[PDB]
Design a protein around this ligand. Structure first.
Ligand SMILES: [Cl-]
Ligand SMILES: [Cl-]
Length: 162
């Protein structure tokens, strides 16, 4: 299993504009378009993004190309963040996937906010971190996806995804 197959399971694929769990305008593999209420402000973002007139609908390829971009962006933002970088560096290969997962979903600023959890992950206190991570809006809103991610950090295996 790898980072792409993991996110594809957590986010799903959709070829038509839709609203995310928070109510935002999204498309493809969890690509957020706009936090704006307007379907028009969404269609326009979408055309800029693809380089064509989409009229709210894209192909598989287009969907995957956006996904490639977003994963890369997520990885580079982690390596550029003074708070994230060190954590990532301290982690093994699986766990590293788990942090990329939170970052793709919640943004760098967001995860950079889990000060305590970050500190415990760095210290390799797995069980403690799993417990602290659950005390968050994140976990309360998307509990099953949170659980999957959290098990990945606790265990270091891909069990929750198999
Ligand atoms: Cl809480
Ligand atoms: Cl969920």
């Amino acid at each position: 299993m790898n980072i792409f197959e993991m996110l594809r399971i957590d986010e799903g694929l959709r070829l038509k504009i839709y609203k995310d769990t928070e109510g935002y305008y999204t498309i493809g593999i969890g690509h957020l378009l706009t936090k704006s209420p307007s379907l028009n402000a969404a269609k326009s973002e979408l055309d800029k993004a693809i380089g064509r007139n989409c009229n709210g609908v894209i192909t598989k390829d287009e969907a995957e190309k956006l996904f490639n971009q977003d994963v890369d962006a997520a990885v580079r933002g982690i390596l550029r963040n003074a708070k994230l970088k060190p954590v990532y560096d301290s982690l093994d290969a699986v766990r590293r996937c788990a942090l990329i997962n939170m970052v793709f979903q919640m943004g760098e600023t967001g995860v950079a906010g889990f000060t305590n959890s970050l500190r415990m992950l760095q210290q390799k206190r797995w069980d403690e971190a799993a417990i602290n991570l659950a005390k968050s809006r994140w976990y309360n809103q998307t509990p099953n996806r949170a659980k999957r991610v959290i098990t990945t950090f606790r265990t270091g295996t891909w069990d929750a995804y198999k």
